[PDB]
Amino acid sequence: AFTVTVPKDLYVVEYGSNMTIECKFPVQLDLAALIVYWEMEDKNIIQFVHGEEDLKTQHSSYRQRARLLKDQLSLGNAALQITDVKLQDAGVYRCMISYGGADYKRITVKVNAPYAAALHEH
Amino acid sequence: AFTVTVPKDLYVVEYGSNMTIECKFPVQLDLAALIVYWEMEDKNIIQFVHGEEDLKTQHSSYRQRARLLKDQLSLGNAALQITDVKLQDAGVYRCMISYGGADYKRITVKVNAPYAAALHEH
């Protein structure tokens, strides 16, 4: 059965940093058979369908900050890079991968920030 | 955990008939959070992403014959209707559903046909 794995399911990062969170899936890669869908608490981050990124329902809090590392896909690695991490990025992410089957995993992200930074986003 | 279920995982149909095969997923439905991806033995049938059907990598053997019944989605039912069933439609279908998680199921389809009909497609 198709299984998605997460070697690391807890990330603790500082606000303003860049972070790359990863889900592994078994793989030469056939982009025509692949869907990668990253989401966090009902906010869509990445929809990648047959080699094309669809931003149509990406949540505005992630606009211009979220990237799927496409070169990693050929390694069986769905790697989501978030730049300039916000307080609002803390939470549980789900990677939903379809590739001859479908599975998902949950990744917890914590963001540390001083009071003034958390107040910026309050 | 998000689970996709198949009440019926074996369909036996006659060539030239219409058949509707179904996968259930737990659900008001948020089309913005949903992906339905139907495939059969490396042939893409349906990709339905945030309420829009993407035919870009649909396999040519299913062109004009495959429909996702959208009204069933609000019931937690991914229903794939194949019209004018061909011999080539026999095989194992996978429904890969992403909706706050992701899961899949396998459905076996057998197609009965007389010799002349199988010869048409040989």
What's this structure's resolution in Å?
Answer: 1.3
Structural domain harbouring B64: 1-122
Taking the alpha carbons at both ends of chain B, their separation in whole angstroms is: 43
What are the residues facing A5 on neighbouring strands? A24
What are the residues facing B77 on neighbouring strands? B24
Residues from chain A contacting residue B96 (CB–CB below 8 Å): 35, 98, 101-102
In chain A, the residue whose alpha carbon lies closest to the alpha carbon of B102 is A103
How far is the C-alpha of A99 from the C-alpha of B113, rounded, in Å? 31
In chain A, the residue whose alpha carbon lies closest to the alpha carbon of B4 is A102
How far is the C-alpha of A94 from the C-alpha of A15, rounded, in Å? 21
Task: Specify the pairing of strand B35-40 against strand A52-53.
Answer: unpaired
- Residue B25 burial class via C-beta count within 10 angstroms: exposed 0-12, middle 13-18, buried 19 and up: buried
Q: How many CB atoms lie within 10 A of CB A89?
A: 24
How far is the C-alpha of A92 from the C-alpha of A56, rounded, in Å? 22
Mutating which of A5, A58, A98, A105 best tests the B interface, going by the most B Cβ atoms within 10 A? A98
Q: What is the experimental method?
A: X-ray
**Interchain CB contact of A50 with B (< 8 Å):** yes
Q: Are A38 and A58 in contact (CB under 8 A)?
A: no
CB contact under 8 A, B98 and A37: yes
- Compute CA distances A18 → A48, A118, B55, B106, whole Å: 21, 17, 35, 39
- Identify the CATH number of the domain in which residue B111 sits: 2.60.40.10
Q: What is the DSSP string of A10-79?
A: EEEEETT--EEEEEE------GGG-EEEEEETTEEEEEEETTEE--TT--GGGTTTEEE-HHHHTTTEEE
The total of structural domains in chain A comes to: 1
